[PDB]
């Protein structure tokens, strides 16, 4: 899967 996300969902 490939998708953009928030910096928050990053960690």
């Amino acid at each position, epitope marked *: *899967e*490939q998708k953009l996300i928030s*910096e928050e969902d*990053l960690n």
Partner: antibody
Amino acid sequence: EVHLVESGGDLVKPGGSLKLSCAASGFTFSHYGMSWVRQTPDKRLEWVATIGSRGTYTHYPDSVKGRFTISRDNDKNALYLQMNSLKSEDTAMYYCARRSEFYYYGNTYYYSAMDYWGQGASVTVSS
Amino acid sequence: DIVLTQSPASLAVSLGQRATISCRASESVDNYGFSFMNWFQQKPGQPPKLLIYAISNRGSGVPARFSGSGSGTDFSLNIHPVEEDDPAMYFCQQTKEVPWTFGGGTKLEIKR
């Protein structure tokens, strides 16, 4: 849904200063890192600034390094861009944008994908 | 700095035809298995719009007519078929490192 509205655009004589603001709405502002990108008459887009979600990390291109400073007030859902020592070269259309990072096959990476932009704020530096 | 060179500068394509814009990079944009290549669409009087991210991923609300390809230092945007709504400016941005530079831009016009 996602809405970013800019303001503060105006004429400024060289060596002056201006503070652009960007009203954010329709998403949890505090979870994303915002940015500012300007476009000159020659149409070329130039990334100018970017701040982290919490507002602790920030960075700029050698272009406006030292004259510009990005800031944010998550309680007021707003992004700001303070400009000082304005050259005529800085005249352009200033846009603010949301940034999204990347989910690549089971892991996460800082990407800096500007997925949403405000209408823009025209800025002219002329005597 | 890593500058991108976009070619052609402008382009005229008939309705239903294919439009192929290219973007070449100075250094390699590859990393972790992907590339920090991004395409934007800017229609006159409007703020650029995100079309593709990470080489081939479509932005939200971007029809399959748009696709990205390429690796390393060479990438391209493909539009097939081209529709009335497409005449605009197209830039290719890189984000593998600061500064994150945009390509020169390619103007796309409907040939009629």
